[PDB]
């Protein structure tokens, strides 16, 4: 594969001392969790956790204790950093309902105070389409008046509406493909359409850091699943070679199909897939490509068409293009784009098309209006300006953070910015200290990230102005001084 523009990603290795201290902290916290379970065993301390009812105490216990050891002892201690209720439109500034816990995050009490004007780095609205005013809101209001909220049937049944066909035509024109199909949920898009494409006797080559929906879709299909290293084209090529040469494992029969599941942007890593090399490999080894383009469909591309446009490649080379409307367009749903034969087969054989309720009409209207705004049909230059502004914000934020001294993962063009915290206590400390300073951030550990590399993800937006970014950067610098989070050796 040939790259027209330079491809600059950096994943700095964890400092040895930092990794050692992370292991020490996790170990001591696990020992104290063991002591807590022992204390709760003889009821030395009261049990805030719920218990099985007395009538059902003689059943086999619903949960194995060790299975939730993480949830009760590790996650529960810093639980206040997640599930923060918001009482405002999730724009650049969001209103957070303040809550407090007097039993160490076991139960939360909602104080009357509302934290207003929090700089929002957690929400996904890359192009700033999360608004409660504007043309998309007015169109959604009109369609909600005409159609109501929700539909009460399936697409193959009476649940197919003219709005759905209009949306699918528009999405196909947007992507550059022959046809597209829309679904009520992106997680459902994956989990319900991957099983239709492949089955037993086929092979799925899945990236190491694929989304849970992609993994579930691969598991629901009966195909063999093999994992290659994240954006490692050498690992992927070796897997392709071996798979073609040696056939199916028990009986060395040739595979029916080989499907490569990749993502346009891996949000937790902030890396952009090496799409030119993947397309070259799939052309050489006659594989099929499933590109989950949820985090890049609006975020990447000169005109916001995704990773394919970002690389200047042909949309027709990708066999299946997943996308999600949640991240950039500001409405729920998902889509699959491809050739007309593929979309016809999916309309016939998708699990969602047969058993799941269609998209909501106001939601599809908001998607339609946002998409026409992006592709210039709104008659105003607002959709373009969003794309340049998001690009500028990404470049500015990433450069400022890197020259402050933090370790930042991913490609330099990726609007998701993961900052490495590396320690379990710092996961809670960073979220609490940043909310104390009026910035809402997202922090993640095991259920989304590997062990040592726990992180804070910043989602940049075109709604973010430079004043907002400057405020956030200043508070991040202050907190990094406070929490000693500048682990980088190269720049500071």
């Amino acid at each position: 594969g040939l790259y027209k523009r330079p491809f600059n990603e950096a994943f700095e290795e964890t400092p040895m001392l930092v990794a050692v201290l992370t292991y020490v902290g996790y170990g001591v916290l696990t020992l104290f969790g063991y002591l807590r379970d022992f204390l709760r065993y003889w009821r030395i301390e009261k049990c805030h956790h719920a218990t099985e009812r007395e009538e059902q105490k003689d059943f086999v216990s619903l949960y194995q204790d060790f299975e939730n050891f993480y949830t009760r002892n590790l996650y529960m201690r810093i639980r206040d950093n997640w599930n923060r209720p918001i009482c405002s439109v999730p724009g650049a500034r969001v209103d957070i309902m303040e809550r407090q816990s007097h039993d160490y995050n076991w139960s939360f009490k909602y104080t009357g105070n509302i934290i207003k004007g929090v700089i929002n780095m957690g929400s996904y609205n890359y192009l700033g389409f999360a608004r409660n005013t504007g043309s998309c809101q007015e169109a959604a209001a009109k369609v909600l008046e005409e159609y109501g909220a929700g539909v009460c049937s399936t697409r193959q049944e009476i649940g197919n509406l003219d709005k759905h066909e209009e949306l699918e035509e528009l999405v196909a024109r947007f992507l550059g493909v022959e046809a597209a199909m829309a679904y009520g949920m992106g997680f459902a898009t994956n989990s319900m359409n991957i099983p239709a494409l492949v089955g037993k006797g086929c092979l799925i080559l899945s990236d190491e850091l694929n989304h849970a929906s992609l993994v579930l879709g691969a598991r629901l299909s009966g195909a063999t699943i093999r994992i290659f290293k994240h954006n490692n084209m050498q690992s992927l090529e070796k897997l392709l070679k071996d798979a073609i040469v040696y056939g199916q494992p028990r009986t060395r029969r040739p595979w029916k199909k080989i499907l490569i599941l990749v993502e346009g942007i891996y949000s937790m890593e902030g890396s952009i897939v090496r799409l030119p090399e993947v397309i070259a490999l799939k052309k050489k080894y006659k594989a099929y490509l499933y590109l989950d383009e949820a985090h890049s469909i609006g975020a990447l591309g000169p005109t916001g068409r995704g990773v394919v446009e970002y690389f200047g490649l042909d949309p027709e080379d990708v066999d299946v293009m997943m996308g999600t409307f949640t991240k950039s367009f500001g409405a729920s749903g998902g889509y699959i784009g491809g050739k007309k034969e593929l979309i016809d087969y999916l309309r016939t054989h998708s699990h969602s098309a047969v058993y799941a309720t269609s998209l909501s009409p106001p939601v599809v209207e908001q998607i339609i209006t946002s998409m026409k705004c992006i592709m210039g049909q709104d008659g105003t230059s607002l959709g373009k300006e969003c794309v340049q502004q998001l690009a500028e914000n990404t470049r500015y934020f990433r450069r400022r953070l890197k020259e402050m001294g933090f370790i930042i993962y991913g490609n330099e063009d990726s609007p998701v910015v993961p900052l490495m915290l590396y320690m379990p206590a710092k996961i809670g400390a960073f979220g609490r200290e940043m909310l104390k300073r009026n910035i809402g951030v997202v922090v993640v550990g095991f259920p989304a990230t590997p062990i040592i590399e726990s992180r804070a993800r910043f989602c940049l937006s075109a709604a973010h102005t430079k004043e907002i970014l400057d405020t956030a950067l200043k508070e991040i610098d202050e907190v990094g001084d406070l929490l000693q989070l500048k682990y980088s050796r190269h720049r500071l």
Binding site: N132, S153, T357
Partner: protein, 423 residues
């Protein structure tokens, strides 16, 4: 082993199957019915004015002005999308309000909101059932239950539809393997997965006997309420209220907010000890964006309307009884379902050997009925993927909007059309 030249020859000569197989042009599911406007009572389907007998809108809340007003208020307050999962600032106050309202409506401790109706149960089942567990599931279970059972890697023991003797035989057998190996038994979990009102058959589960078997053989009960949530019981609380069972005897109750509430989404209710697990183990909950606030407000207003007026369930019951009685006696069709079911089936009394011939006959009836101002739909299934594939049938769905004379006319029109087609 192999030479590099041999390996490159093998790579060169390998031709994969096409990504999608060729699809017949004469496929029934290939032609969607395009509905112009809302899918409401008195809808337009395929360019024809029709009375809706297809959409699962039991309480007529799709075009209720109060529901639309609440949804518009939430839209003006929040916009359409949530822009994140429940974990990351995707939790609005409307979501907590809806969860609280559902928990108070169902008389349970807690409820959890999924943004997709399939995903709620397809993710609730795998969360509790793991490898080595034994699940006893009714064979006539919906596809979402089947995919939830497949996502978990537990043993699956299908039992015959509403047959308590079959379930009890399976339980006694499992007791025999428990006796053979005690240590694995002490860690093996048992689940009975049933549906309060089955969509594939239109029948109601024997819940009292299920509860007795649960306590005798120590198997936790998961109960799907997609059809029965807002239709059954004096206050429309499900099959538990219909049978008088205490809701504490049911370990999990899952429904979708799409049929009676007439908005996108699903929910699972139960004791907090059970529900709190899904907030970190439910894949459709953790790894998907939360429900749009306007849909949540529509569901909340639907709950308000159901609570204020519990006579809607009585009128729904009487309309279901009327249409069920009127449809009895079709020359070539048999009514499959129960009088208290809002959605039931019209299967062929004598089926030709070929299933696609039966589908073509049913579609002939459906098309001639749409030419006569009645919107009927044929129950659609994935033939290869379904475990127990139901027979082809025409689906009859009853709504409080459909008047008595409309129900009589629909029955008479179906009778005439079916007796012409099947002659």
């Amino acid at each position: 082993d192999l030479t590099v030249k041999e390996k490159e020859e093998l790579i060169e000569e390998w031709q994969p199957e096409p990504l999608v197989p060729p699809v017949p042009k004469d496929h029934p599911a290939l032609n969607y019915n395009i509905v112009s406007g809302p899918p409401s009572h008195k809808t337009v389907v395929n360019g024809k004015e029709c009375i809706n007998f297809a959409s699962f809108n039991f309480l007529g809340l799709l075009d209720n002005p109060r529901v639309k007003a609440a949804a518009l208020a939430s839209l003006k307050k929040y916009g359409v999308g949530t822009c994140g999962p429940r974990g990351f600032y995707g939790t609005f106050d409307v979501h907590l309000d809806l969860e609280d309202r559902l928990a108070k409506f169902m008389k349970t401790e807690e409820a959890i909101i999924y943004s997709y109706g399939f995903a709620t149960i397809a993710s609730a089942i795998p969360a509790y059932s793991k490898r080595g567990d034994i699940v006893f599931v009714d064979r006539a279970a919906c596809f979402a239950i089947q995919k939830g059972l497949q996502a978990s890697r537990s043993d699956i023991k299908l039992f015959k539809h509403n047959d308590m003797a079959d379930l009890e035989r399976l339980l006694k057998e499992q007791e025999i393997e428990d006796q053979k190996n005690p240590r694995k038994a002490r860690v093996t979990r048992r689940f009975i997965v049933v549906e309060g009102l089955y969509m594939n058959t239109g029948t109601i589960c024997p819940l009292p006997e299920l509860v007795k078997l649960k306590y005798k053989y120590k198997a936790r009960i998961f109960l799907e309420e997609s059809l029965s949530f807002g239709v059954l019981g004096e206050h429309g609380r499900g099959v538990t209220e219909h049978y008088g069972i205490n809701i504490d005897d049911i370990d999990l109750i899952s429904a979708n907010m799409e049929n009676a509430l007439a908005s996108i989404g699903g929910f699972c209710c139960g004791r907090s000890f059970v529900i709190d697990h899904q907030r970190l183990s439910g894949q459709g909950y953790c790894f998907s964006a939360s429900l749009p606030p306007l849909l949540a407000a529509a569901a909340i207003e639907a709950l308000n309307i159901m609570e204020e007026n519990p006579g809607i369930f009585a009128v729904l019951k009487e309309k279901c009884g009327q249409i069920h009685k009127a449809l009895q006696g079709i020359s070539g069709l048999k009514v499959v379902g129960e009088s208290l079911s809002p959605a039931f089936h019209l299967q062929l009394e004598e089926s030709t050997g070929s299933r696609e011939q039966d589908v073509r006959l049913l579609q002939e009836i459906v098309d001639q009925c749409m030419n006569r101002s009645i919107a009927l739909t044929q129950a659609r299934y994935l033939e290869k993927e379904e475990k127990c594939l139901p027979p082809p049938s025409i689906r009859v769905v009853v709504t409080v909007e459909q008047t008595e004379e409309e129900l009589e006319r629909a029955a008479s029109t179906i009778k005439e059309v079916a007796q012409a087609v099947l002659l």
